[PDB]
Design a protein around this nucleic acid. Structure first.
Ligand SMILES: Nc1ncnc2c1ncn2[C@H]1C[C@H](O)[C@@H](COP(=O)(O)OP(=O)(O)OP(=O)(O)O)O1
Ligand SMILES: [Ca+2]
Ligand SMILES: [Mn+2]
Length: 430
DNA sequence: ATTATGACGCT
DNA sequence: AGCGTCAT
């Protein structure tokens, strides 16, 4: 009862860019705006691989991971923008720089945690408190929430989508108790007002649209964000959780989309997140471990305590390339040339990072894959990163991997390498 | 031949 | 440390 924690202590948002790489290309090339279009990397093999898809193109069934030649079968008028190639490889610099544009705007409102190239968590608890006091107990007008959905509403006692949105928003606002400054529902609502402001700022200052989730923790905020995309935001209240989770496949919750989630389903014989409430914490810990068990017990009740970490910059800077099928590297000269290409991109990015962010990487991680292994990485080795010099880094990378070569002949490389990966890690202030 | 990343957990 | 998982 009264001592039962409800995980309503924080206001957390997740802001995620809509079809991000496509918007970056659409800003650059107005011919692509408001069109079925996708971003592709490489081209020779099956037209290139799609990595981002506009919502117009999704209507035709175009998806990520599709070959462009195959996407064209679904959508003959599909427009394409290609990822830049430098030093023989895809180069994602344009999108990383566009990401920084957005992250720096978000950071004006609150502490953010960079969660991917196109999304960040926001801890809005303090900002909400401040806005609540400037608000002096006045009601919140629907006009302040023009793109907000309230998950679970409307309910009870109609045709258009925007009509439904407003109906639900009005039910929510009509029920709000605005003279309690510690009401979690009110806090979420004020959070949503701030996120409208944040999203407007992002669009005004970059041209990019985004969606957002507002809830009491990161997992619910992420889930919320996806419920109404694109260009909308969704508030998931604590009270909405039992109905929301009652038909929510376990795999939809962040961290449960893989083997652990499959094991929860198989071992317990359930399908939906809500069904987890019928197990004791000890039961869940017995199957999934102490940490996962406790996390699942709380999470299926809408409760999670993972903090929004104050980190805007990536912790590592890496460069990787696959060499599939017959392109697998089979000579020492090949392996060395590509290590140099990777190292040259890495040096460029590291040198910029040092100037921008007052830090230096101190460790170089080298990873490779060998033909026939279908693990992502076959082998990882580290060495000291003491100078931002591509020839040195590529020589050092070669040194730590050269013994992987089972070939008798020095020139030849066996078994052929199907992936190379250089990663700069362990940053120190500089 | 579903590529190029990036964070965090386990032992 | 080196490997595995999950993610976008
Ligand atoms: N598996 C991947 N491989 C390479 N790049 C990816 C992959 N997944 C995502 N990206 C890139 C391209 C995306 O535009 C960008 C952001 O990803 P993501 O948020 O999942 O989708 P999205 O922004 O393209 O559309 P959405 O509107 O559904 O969020 O990151
Ligand atoms: Ca996105
Ligand atoms: Mn994303």
């Amino acid at each position: 009862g009264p001592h039962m924690a409800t995980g309503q202590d924080r206001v957390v948002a997740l802001v995620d860019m809509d079809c991000f790489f496509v918007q970056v290309e659409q800003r650059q090339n107005p011919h692509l705006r408001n069109k079925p279009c996708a971003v592709v990397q490489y081209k020779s093999w099956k037209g290139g691989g799609i990595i981002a898809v506009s919502y117009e193109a999704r209507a035709f069934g175009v998806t990520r991971s599709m070959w462009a030649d195959d996407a064209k079968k679904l959508c003959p008028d599909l427009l394409l923008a290609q990822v830049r190639e430098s030093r023989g490889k895809a180069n994602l610099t344009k999108y990383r720089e566009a990401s920084v544009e957005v992250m720096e705007i978000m950071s004006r409102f609150a502490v953010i945690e960079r969660a991917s190239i196109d999304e960040a968590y926001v801890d809005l608890t303090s900002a909400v408190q401040e806005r609540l006091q400037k608000l002096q107990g006045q009601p919140i007008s629907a006009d302040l929430l023009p793109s907000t959905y309230i998950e679970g509403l409307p309910q009870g006692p109609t045709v258009q989508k925007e009509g439904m949105r407003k109906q639900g928003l009005f039910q929510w606002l009509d029920s709000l108790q605005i003279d309690n400054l510690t009401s979690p529902d009110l806090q979420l609502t004020v959070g949503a007002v701030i996120v409208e402001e944040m999203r407007a700022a992002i669009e005004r200052e970059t041209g990019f649209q985004c969606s957002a989730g507002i809830s009491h923790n990161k997992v619910l905020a992420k889930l919320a964000c996806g419920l109404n995309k694109p260009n909308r935001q969704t508030l998931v209240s604590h009270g909405s959780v039992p109905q929301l989770f009652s038909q929510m496949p376990i795999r939809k919750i962040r961290s449960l989309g893989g083997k652990l989630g499959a094991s929860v389903i198989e071992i317990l014989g359930i399908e939906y997140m809500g069904e987890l409430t019928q197990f004791t914490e000890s039961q869940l810990q017995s199957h999934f471990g102490e940490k996962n068990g406790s996390w699942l017990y709380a999470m299926c009740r809408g409760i999670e305590h993972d903090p929004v970490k104050p980190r805007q910059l990536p912790k590592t800077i890496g460069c990787s390339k696959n060499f599939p099928g017959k392109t697998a590297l089979a000579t020492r000269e090949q392996v060395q040339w590509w290590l140099l290409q990777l190292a040259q991109e890495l040096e460029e990015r590291l040198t910029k990072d040092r100037n921008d962010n007052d830090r230096v990487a101190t460790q170089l991680v080298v990873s490779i894959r060998v033909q026939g292994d279908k693990r992502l990485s076959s082998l990882r080795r580290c060495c000291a990163l003491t100078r931002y010099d591509a020839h040195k880094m590529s020589h050092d990378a070669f040194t730590v991997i050269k013994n992987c070569n089972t070939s008798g002949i020095q020139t030849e490389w066996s078994p052929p390498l199907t992936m190379l990966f250089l990663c700069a890690t362990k940053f120190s202030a500089s």
